Design a protein around this ligand. Sequence first.
Ligand SMILES: O=C(c1ccncc1)c1ccc(F)cc1
Length: 126
Amino acid sequence: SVKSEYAEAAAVGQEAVAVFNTMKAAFQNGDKEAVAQYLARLASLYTRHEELLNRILEKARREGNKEAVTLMNEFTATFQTGKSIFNAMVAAFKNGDDDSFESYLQALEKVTAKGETLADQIAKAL
Ligand SMILES: O=C(c1ccncc1)c1ccc(F)cc1
């Protein structure tokens, strides 16, 4: 069901949360080799999450589930804010700009924490 596909998508989201927090620790410790690997892992995780969310939104649309579509349009928009900030963080790492990396990292945390009430609403709506 679309609901079970959303729970599968929620787990992937949580996998990225885990890898992100490991990555933050590595950054703070200056283990740049680890950071590079974690950033690659996050890129794959976010790409997978984005795809599952799109399939869920498209299904909710085909089902005529107007409230779920509204919530998923809002949530996917916020997901893209996170994606843009993530990509900027990756660029800051490439460039050696630790000040920008730190900035983008906190911002990505706040965008993600904000979006969690909506994430829980979607589970109930599908
Ligand atoms: O911040 C992000 C994000 C980070 C990197 N690429 C895409 C989304 C995010 C990921 C999942 C989510 F549910 C809300 C936000």
